[PDB]
Amino acid sequence: GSHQEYIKKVADELKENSQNINDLLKEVEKNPEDMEYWNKIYRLLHTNKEIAETAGFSSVAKVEHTAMNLVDKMLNSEIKITSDLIDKIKKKVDMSTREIDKK
């Protein structure tokens, strides 16, 4: 029905932005200090958090928020950018896409 179609449309938008994040992660891993990529990743996470909150994807929104907080610390030079930190970000992005699929 229309309610299922609405949720599918929202999920498609969230997935598209998550794929955009993953495309940027493939680049930034070859130059981790390149803040152009992290800024774009942050704004995509921020966009997805908003979409998810509006549509009732509460678990998605919480994971995006956790990932955003890490990227914000990186952008403000509050934490060192390491391979372990990038792995944590990838883990959260993967959990976000699993949560999208659950809806």
GROMACS .gro file of N, CA and C in nm:
model
  309
    1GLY      N    1   0.083  -0.120   0.000
    1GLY     CA    2   0.000   0.000   0.000
    1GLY      C    3   0.086   0.125   0.000
    2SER      N    4   0.024   0.243   0.010
    2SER     CA    5   0.099   0.367   0.000
    2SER      C    6   0.196   0.381   0.115
    3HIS      N    7   0.162   0.328   0.232
    3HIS     CA    8   0.253   0.338   0.346
    3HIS      C    9   0.379   0.255   0.324
    4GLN      N   10   0.365   0.134   0.270
    4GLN     CA   11   0.484   0.057   0.236
    4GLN      C   12   0.564   0.126   0.127
    5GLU      N   13   0.496   0.184   0.027
    5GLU     CA   14   0.567   0.254  -0.080
    5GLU      C   15   0.643   0.374  -0.027
    6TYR      N   16   0.585   0.445   0.069
    6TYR     CA   17   0.655   0.557   0.131
    6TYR      C   18   0.783   0.510   0.199
    7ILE      N   19   0.775   0.405   0.278
    7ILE     CA   20   0.893   0.355   0.349
    7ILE      C   21   0.999   0.306   0.251
    8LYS      N   22   0.957   0.242   0.141
    8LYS     CA   23   1.053   0.198   0.039
    8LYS      C   24   1.121   0.317  -0.026
    9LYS      N   25   1.046   0.423  -0.056
    9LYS     CA   26   1.107   0.543  -0.114
    9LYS      C   27   1.209   0.603  -0.019
   10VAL      N   28   1.176   0.613   0.110
   10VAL     CA   29   1.270   0.666   0.209
   10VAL      C   30   1.393   0.578   0.216
   11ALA      N   31   1.374   0.447   0.222
   11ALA     CA   32   1.487   0.355   0.229
   11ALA      C   33   1.577   0.370   0.108
   12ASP      N   34   1.517   0.388  -0.011
   12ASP     CA   35   1.598   0.409  -0.131
   12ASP      C   36   1.685   0.533  -0.119
   13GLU      N   37   1.630   0.643  -0.067
   13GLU     CA   38   1.708   0.765  -0.052
   13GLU      C   39   1.821   0.744   0.048
   14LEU      N   40   1.791   0.679   0.160
   14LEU     CA   41   1.893   0.653   0.260
   14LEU      C   42   2.003   0.565   0.202
   15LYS      N   43   1.965   0.463   0.126
   15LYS     CA   44   2.066   0.376   0.064
   15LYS      C   45   2.150   0.450  -0.037
   16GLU      N   46   2.089   0.539  -0.114
   16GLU     CA   47   2.165   0.613  -0.214
   16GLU      C   48   2.269   0.700  -0.146
   17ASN      N   49   2.232   0.765  -0.037
   17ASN     CA   50   2.331   0.847   0.032
   17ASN      C   51   2.437   0.761   0.098
   18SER      N   52   2.400   0.643   0.145
   18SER     CA   53   2.500   0.554   0.204
   18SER      C   54   2.598   0.505   0.099
   19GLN      N   55   2.551   0.479  -0.023
   19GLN     CA   56   2.641   0.439  -0.130
   19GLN      C   57   2.732   0.555  -0.166
   20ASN      N   58   2.680   0.678  -0.162
   20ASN     CA   59   2.765   0.794  -0.184
   20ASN      C   60   2.875   0.801  -0.078
   21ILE      N   61   2.839   0.777   0.048
   21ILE     CA   62   2.939   0.772   0.154
   21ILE      C   63   3.044   0.665   0.123
   22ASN      N   64   2.999   0.546   0.084
   22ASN     CA   65   3.095   0.441   0.056
   22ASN      C   66   3.186   0.474  -0.062
   23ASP      N   67   3.135   0.544  -0.164
   23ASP     CA   68   3.218   0.587  -0.276
   23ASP      C   69   3.326   0.684  -0.227
   24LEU      N   70   3.290   0.773  -0.135
   24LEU     CA   71   3.388   0.866  -0.080
   24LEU      C   72   3.486   0.798   0.013
   25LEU      N   73   3.440   0.699   0.090
   25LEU     CA   74   3.533   0.624   0.174
   25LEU      C   75   3.637   0.551   0.090
   26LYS      N   76   3.602   0.506  -0.030
   26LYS     CA   77   3.703   0.440  -0.112
   26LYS      C   78   3.812   0.538  -0.150
   27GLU      N   79   3.777   0.664  -0.171
   27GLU     CA   80   3.878   0.764  -0.202
   27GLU      C   81   3.957   0.806  -0.078
   28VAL      N   82   3.889   0.828   0.035
   28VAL     CA   83   3.958   0.893   0.146
   28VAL      C   84   4.054   0.795   0.211
   29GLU      N   85   4.033   0.665   0.195
   29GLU     CA   86   4.127   0.568   0.250
   29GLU      C   87   4.262   0.574   0.180
   30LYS      N   88   4.267   0.623   0.057
   30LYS     CA   89   4.394   0.644  -0.011
   30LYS      C   90   4.458   0.778   0.025
   31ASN      N   91   4.388   0.863   0.099
   31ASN     CA   92   4.443   0.989   0.148
   31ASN      C   93   4.366   1.030   0.272
   32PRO      N   94   4.388   0.960   0.385
   32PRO     CA   95   4.301   0.982   0.503
   32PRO      C   96   4.295   1.125   0.553
   33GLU      N   97   4.396   1.207   0.531
   33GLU     CA   98   4.394   1.343   0.583
   33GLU      C   99   4.321   1.440   0.492
   34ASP      N  100   4.257   1.390   0.386
   34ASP     CA  101   4.191   1.480   0.290
   34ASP      C  102   4.053   1.515   0.344
   35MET      N  103   4.045   1.635   0.399
   35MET     CA  104   3.925   1.679   0.467
   35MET      C  105   3.811   1.708   0.370
   36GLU      N  106   3.840   1.723   0.241
   36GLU     CA  107   3.732   1.741   0.145
   36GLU      C  108   3.637   1.622   0.150
   37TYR      N  109   3.693   1.501   0.160
   37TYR     CA  110   3.611   1.381   0.164
   37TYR      C  111   3.537   1.371   0.296
   38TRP      N  112   3.603   1.400   0.408
   38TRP     CA  113   3.535   1.387   0.536
   38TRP      C  114   3.423   1.489   0.551
   39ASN      N  115   3.442   1.611   0.501
   39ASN     CA  116   3.334   1.708   0.505
   39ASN      C  117   3.213   1.660   0.429
   40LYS      N  118   3.233   1.605   0.308
   40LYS     CA  119   3.121   1.555   0.229
   40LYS      C  120   3.054   1.438   0.298
   41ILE      N  121   3.134   1.348   0.358
   41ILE     CA  122   3.080   1.234   0.432
   41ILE      C  123   2.995   1.283   0.548
   42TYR      N  124   3.045   1.381   0.623
   42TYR     CA  125   2.968   1.435   0.735
   42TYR      C  126   2.833   1.485   0.687
   43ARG      N  127   2.832   1.566   0.581
   43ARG     CA  128   2.706   1.627   0.538
   43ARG      C  129   2.609   1.523   0.484
   44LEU      N  130   2.660   1.413   0.426
   44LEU     CA  131   2.572   1.303   0.384
   44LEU      C  132   2.514   1.230   0.504
   45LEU      N  133   2.596   1.205   0.606
   45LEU     CA  134   2.544   1.144   0.729
   45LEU      C  135   2.437   1.232   0.793
   46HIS      N  136   2.462   1.363   0.797
   46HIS     CA  137   2.369   1.459   0.855
   46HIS      C  138   2.236   1.457   0.780
   47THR      N  139   2.243   1.452   0.647
   47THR     CA  140   2.125   1.442   0.561
   47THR      C  141   2.048   1.315   0.592
   48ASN      N  142   2.119   1.202   0.601
   48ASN     CA  143   2.050   1.076   0.629
   48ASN      C  144   1.988   1.076   0.768
   49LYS      N  145   2.057   1.131   0.867
   49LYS     CA  146   1.998   1.138   1.000
   49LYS      C  147   1.864   1.209   0.994
   50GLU      N  148   1.858   1.323   0.925
   50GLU     CA  149   1.734   1.399   0.913
   50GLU      C  150   1.624   1.316   0.846
   51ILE      N  151   1.655   1.254   0.732
   51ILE     CA  152   1.557   1.175   0.659
   51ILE      C  153   1.505   1.064   0.748
   52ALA      N  154   1.597   0.996   0.816
   52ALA     CA  155   1.559   0.881   0.897
   52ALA      C  156   1.469   0.924   1.012
   53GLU      N  157   1.502   1.035   1.078
   53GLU     CA  158   1.420   1.085   1.187
   53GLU      C  159   1.280   1.118   1.138
   54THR      N  160   1.270   1.188   1.026
   54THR     CA  161   1.138   1.226   0.974
   54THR      C  162   1.050   1.104   0.949
   55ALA      N  163   1.107   0.995   0.900
   55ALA     CA  164   1.030   0.882   0.852
   55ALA      C  165   1.013   0.773   0.955
   56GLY      N  166   1.071   0.790   1.074
   56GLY     CA  167   1.060   0.691   1.178
   56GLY      C  168   1.160   0.578   1.169
   57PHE      N  169   1.269   0.596   1.094
   57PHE     CA  170   1.380   0.500   1.095
   57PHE      C  171   1.471   0.535   1.215
   58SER      N  172   1.420   0.511   1.336
   58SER     CA  173   1.488   0.559   1.456
   58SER      C  174   1.625   0.496   1.475
   59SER      N  175   1.638   0.366   1.449
   59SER     CA  176   1.767   0.300   1.467
   59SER      C  177   1.868   0.349   1.365
   60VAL      N  178   1.824   0.374   1.241
   60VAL     CA  179   1.915   0.431   1.142
   60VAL      C  180   1.964   0.567   1.190
   61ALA      N  181   1.873   0.650   1.237
   61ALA     CA  182   1.914   0.784   1.277
   61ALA      C  183   2.018   0.779   1.388
   62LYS      N  184   2.003   0.687   1.483
   62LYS     CA  185   2.098   0.678   1.594
   62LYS      C  186   2.236   0.638   1.545
   63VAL      N  187   2.244   0.544   1.452
   63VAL     CA  188   2.375   0.504   1.400
   63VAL      C  189   2.440   0.617   1.321
   64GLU      N  190   2.363   0.686   1.236
   64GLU     CA  191   2.420   0.799   1.163
   64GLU      C  192   2.473   0.903   1.260
   65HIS      N  193   2.402   0.927   1.369
   65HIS     CA  194   2.447   1.024   1.468
   65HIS      C  195   2.581   0.983   1.529
   66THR      N  196   2.595   0.856   1.566
   66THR     CA  197   2.721   0.808   1.621
   66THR      C  198   2.834   0.828   1.521
   67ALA      N  199   2.810   0.796   1.394
   67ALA     CA  200   2.913   0.813   1.291
   67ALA      C  201   2.946   0.960   1.272
   68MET      N  202   2.844   1.046   1.272
   68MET     CA  203   2.867   1.189   1.257
   68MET      C  204   2.955   1.242   1.368
   69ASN      N  205   2.934   1.195   1.490
   69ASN     CA  206   3.011   1.248   1.602
   69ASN      C  207   3.159   1.215   1.585
   70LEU      N  208   3.189   1.097   1.533
   70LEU     CA  209   3.329   1.064   1.505
   70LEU      C  210   3.386   1.153   1.396
   71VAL      N  211   3.312   1.169   1.286
   71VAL     CA  212   3.363   1.249   1.175
   71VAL      C  213   3.379   1.395   1.219
   72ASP      N  214   3.287   1.447   1.302
   72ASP     CA  215   3.300   1.584   1.351
   72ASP      C  216   3.429   1.600   1.430
   73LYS      N  217   3.461   1.504   1.517
   73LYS     CA  218   3.586   1.510   1.592
   73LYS      C  219   3.707   1.509   1.499
   74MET      N  220   3.702   1.429   1.393
   74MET     CA  221   3.809   1.429   1.295
   74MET      C  222   3.822   1.565   1.227
   75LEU      N  223   3.710   1.624   1.185
   75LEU     CA  224   3.713   1.751   1.114
   75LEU      C  225   3.763   1.863   1.203
   76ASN      N  226   3.738   1.855   1.334
   76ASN     CA  227   3.783   1.956   1.428
   76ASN      C  228   3.916   1.920   1.493
   77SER      N  229   3.984   1.817   1.443
   77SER     CA  230   4.116   1.778   1.493
   77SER      C  231   4.113   1.743   1.642
   78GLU      N  232   4.003   1.686   1.690
   78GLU     CA  233   3.995   1.642   1.828
   78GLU      C  234   4.045   1.499   1.848
   79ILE      N  235   4.047   1.417   1.743
   79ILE     CA  236   4.100   1.282   1.747
   79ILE      C  237   4.188   1.258   1.624
   80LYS      N  238   4.289   1.173   1.641
   80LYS     CA  239   4.378   1.137   1.531
   80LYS      C  240   4.310   1.041   1.434
   81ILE      N  241   4.329   1.064   1.304
   81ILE     CA  242   4.271   0.979   1.201
   81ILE      C  243   4.362   0.859   1.180
   82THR      N  244   4.314   0.742   1.219
   82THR     CA  245   4.390   0.618   1.214
   82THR      C  246   4.312   0.515   1.135
   83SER      N  247   4.380   0.406   1.099
   83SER     CA  248   4.310   0.299   1.030
   83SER      C  249   4.204   0.237   1.119
   84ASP      N  250   4.230   0.229   1.250
   84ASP     CA  251   4.130   0.175   1.342
   84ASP      C  252   4.007   0.264   1.348
   85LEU      N  253   4.025   0.395   1.342
   85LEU     CA  254   3.911   0.485   1.342
   85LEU      C  255   3.832   0.473   1.213
   86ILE      N  256   3.901   0.466   1.098
   86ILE     CA  257   3.829   0.450   0.972
   86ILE      C  258   3.752   0.318   0.971
   87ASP      N  259   3.811   0.212   1.026
   87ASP     CA  260   3.740   0.085   1.039
   87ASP      C  261   3.614   0.101   1.122
   88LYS      N  262   3.621   0.177   1.232
   88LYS     CA  263   3.502   0.202   1.313
   88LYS      C  264   3.395   0.276   1.233
   89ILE      N  265   3.435   0.374   1.151
   89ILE     CA  266   3.338   0.446   1.070
   89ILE      C  267   3.274   0.353   0.969
   90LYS      N  268   3.356   0.270   0.903
   90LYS     CA  269   3.302   0.172   0.808
   90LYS      C  270   3.205   0.078   0.876
   91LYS      N  271   3.239   0.033   0.998
   91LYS     CA  272   3.149  -0.053   1.074
   91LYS      C  273   3.014   0.013   1.097
   92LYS      N  274   3.013   0.142   1.132
   92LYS     CA  275   2.887   0.213   1.155
   92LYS      C  276   2.810   0.234   1.025
   93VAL      N  277   2.880   0.264   0.916
   93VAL     CA  278   2.810   0.276   0.788
   93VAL      C  279   2.746   0.143   0.751
   94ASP      N  280   2.818   0.032   0.769
   94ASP     CA  281   2.761  -0.099   0.740
   94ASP      C  282   2.642  -0.129   0.831
   95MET      N  283   2.650  -0.095   0.959
   95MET     CA  284   2.536  -0.117   1.046
   95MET      C  285   2.417  -0.032   1.002
   96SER      N  286   2.443   0.090   0.955
   96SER     CA  287   2.335   0.175   0.908
   96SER      C  288   2.264   0.113   0.788
   97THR      N  289   2.340   0.055   0.695
   97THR     CA  290   2.274  -0.004   0.580
   97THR      C  291   2.197  -0.129   0.619
   98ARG      N  292   2.245  -0.208   0.717
   98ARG     CA  293   2.166  -0.320   0.767
   98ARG      C  294   2.038  -0.271   0.833
   99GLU      N  295   2.045  -0.160   0.906
   99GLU     CA  296   1.924  -0.108   0.971
   99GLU      C  297   1.825  -0.055   0.868
  100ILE      N  298   1.873   0.007   0.759
  100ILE     CA  299   1.784   0.051   0.652
  100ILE      C  300   1.707  -0.068   0.595
  101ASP      N  301   1.778  -0.178   0.570
  101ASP     CA  302   1.717  -0.295   0.509
  101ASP      C  303   1.610  -0.355   0.598
  102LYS      N  304   1.623  -0.340   0.730
  102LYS     CA  305   1.527  -0.399   0.821
  102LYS      C  306   1.390  -0.334   0.812
  103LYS      N  307   1.383  -0.210   0.765
  103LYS     CA  308   1.255  -0.140   0.757
  103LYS      C  309   1.173  -0.178   0.633
   0.00000   0.00000   0.00000
